[model samples]
Target chain A: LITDQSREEFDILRYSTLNTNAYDYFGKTLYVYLDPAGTGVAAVGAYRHQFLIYGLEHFFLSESSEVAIAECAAHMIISVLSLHPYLDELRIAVEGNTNQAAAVRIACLIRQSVQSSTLIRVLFYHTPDQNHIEQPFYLMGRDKALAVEQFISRFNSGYIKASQELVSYTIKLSHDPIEYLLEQIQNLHRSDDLIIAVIMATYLCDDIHAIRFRVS
Target chain B: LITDQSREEFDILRYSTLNTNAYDYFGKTLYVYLDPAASGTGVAAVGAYRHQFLIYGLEHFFLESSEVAIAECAAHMIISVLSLHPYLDELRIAVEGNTNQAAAVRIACLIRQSVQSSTLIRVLFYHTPDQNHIEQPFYLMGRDKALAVEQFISRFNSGYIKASQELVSYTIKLSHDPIEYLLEQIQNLHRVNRISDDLIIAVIMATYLCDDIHAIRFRVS
Candidate 1:
């Protein structure tokens, strides 16, 4: 089994149940990122109820146009709206460069959606500091990333204490998922590892055929 | 990037910790797969303490590969053909964390052969009994019928392969994203009525096959 290190940080959960609680994310700002190749992430603060999808997709396919980013952004934007309709004001915040064509298309898409709906007062970019969403794992949110690492470290230690065989198979899949690695996923879906176990199962048990085998 | 759903089993974990012992894996075998394009994470625990070991990262796979030689650097050959930096990045990610030199080369050979024809990805190794050694190592992505990397060499040497200038140029330009790049090639070639449908599908299969895994999903809930 291979392993990688993550940034370290303080426990917001220790600060209170209030920080990591699901209710905490309900009214928080949402941040979204969609690359040129139709993949992206949308987070409602600290990766709570967050979604990330991508299409390097490949080594030779460099045809990323503004259009691809637009479609991808549109998906994330619609996700934010439909999933969280009880909101007001739409804000765009970008960490890196922009694609003009996609920027304009997404702008129009958001603007039109705002015009068509009365829930969100407006849709525009964020200013220097605002109630913007952030991924502690992805942002200058390195501090937050540290928090994730800690949660994992602590949970892993707690979990591995109880199950060597499960932990070994679990750790092995992290490097590369092989067949039968996921048969233990059911046993793990609700382990003390909680979220990480679920995440690993989702990523490693990637062969739908194997999943089908799990059923039939 | 993609989505797959699994069945809703149960939560015995909440009941107690009776089922997770070393003996649980007594009859089970462990296999590891590394895609040139995915992230790696492994945690080792000798019954409680946590320590992670990094076999390799994207750095060694892509930018560093120029400096690190291998049995068969498929990444090298693919980069030479595509001549793009981003595609190299994708391939590196796809193959990252594959510590097994044999399996890695086998994966590369599989891709190289598939690039030349209508084949798909076949994961190279089946199990790594422990940290000691490997099992069921299929050195070549070959069987009784065919070998992948062979005919491609044959085709290029014989000058039997052909593609439109636009398609070739377009493919290289978008080499950064595997699916989009190939789909665009297929779409462009199809619009011009030049390449065969088989070629387009082969390219599509290449994207999934090269990734070395697939998930055709469904939902019951």
Candidate 2:
């Protein structure tokens, strides 16, 4: 019973290929299999990703002293999901990985706090072997950290144009948390190599799926 | 056989009056008459008057260094005369009046340099006795001097205003040589109580009496 208004509103997914590609097939199967028509699940996934990206962007864009980016990320994810009632059924899988598990748990709490037609659910998965493929995600996370360093460097050198460009790019693409995490991983090549792999693994997570679909 | 244009151009009496009213009219007349109107008699009168008034005004208004005031006065008077050209004759008065005699000589030269066809002439009338009213040109001279002194005092507060009024008055009245001598006498009062009658006699003898027309009117506010 999707109304004409709901249909028009949900059509925003058509323009969101990145969100669709990231969450539609795998995310739907792992987290949103119970109700295929539930759009709340997709909305929650998108909101979580946007929150993560915004956090990383803030971290890299702000000075080192102002490292409240992670908290800001959690806050935005919770608030955005709570405000948008249609995303109440959205859920995530949590594992032993503290960051990923925390992300999922927070997303569910955000959905539950608000009055909505459905409850958001989250699940956890474990994958010890899939770490290699997740290197890109880890790299993206590293890039977020390196962006701050680059900002300081460029600022000191009076390369205002380069600094502004990088900051703008970081902010604009902040909604794509995975892409930003992969950029961080790549930036690690130019950074300290000894702890690079450990840093990448610490920030990267897999076997966790975000489930979001339209509830008809 | 003076043509109307020449007659209109050469008003000897008017020229005499204007020149006489100048600060160094006597010297200017002498100079002009000497050079046969090289510096036109009328202009010599006006320029000399202008220079003297400017000097007097500067001294009266500015309480700074007298030497600086004199130099500035000399420069301003020259520049002003050159620009205004209030006198309708050749401009030939040199800007040099450090001493009284030098100033007097300069004015005398200017007055004697006119060459108008009207055969302009000047006379110095002297009165030895102050007993007869007619024999008291000295008193008349003294009165004229007093008037000039009073005028100078009145305008002593502001240089520009004083110079303007003096110039305006000189332009109207052409017999300012007596006034010029009077200014010199006033200036010397601090140094000497009485100027020798010989000096007064010389000034009166050198005085030119070509006309007595009031070219300037004094206004009060």
Give the interface-residue alpha carbon RMSD of model 1. 14.2
Could you tell me the TM-score of chain A in candidate 1?
0.34
TM-score of each: 0.23, 0.18
Model 2 deviation from native, Cα RMSD in Å: 36.9
Candidate 2 chain B least-lDDT 10 residues: B32-41
TM-score leader: 1
Provide per-model DockQ scores.
Answer: 0.03, 0.00
Which residue runs of candidate 2 sit more than 4 Å off their true CA positions?
A1-71, A79-88, A93-119, A122-182, A188-216, B1-221
Residue B136 accuracy (lDDT) in model 1? 27
What are the per-model C-alpha RMSD values against the true structure? 23.2, 36.9
Q: Judged by DockQ, which candidate is best?
A: 1
Best by lDDT: 1
> What would you estimate as the lDDT of candidate 1?
0.27
> Candidate 1 chain B, which ten residues in sequence have the lowest lDDT sum?
B3-12
- What tens digits encode model 2's per-residue C-alpha lDDT throughout A1-216? 113322221111111212122222222211211001101111122222211111122222234321232233334444444433343333222222234434334334433443343344433222233453221011123354754454334323322110001111223443543333334334433322212222222222222322112221
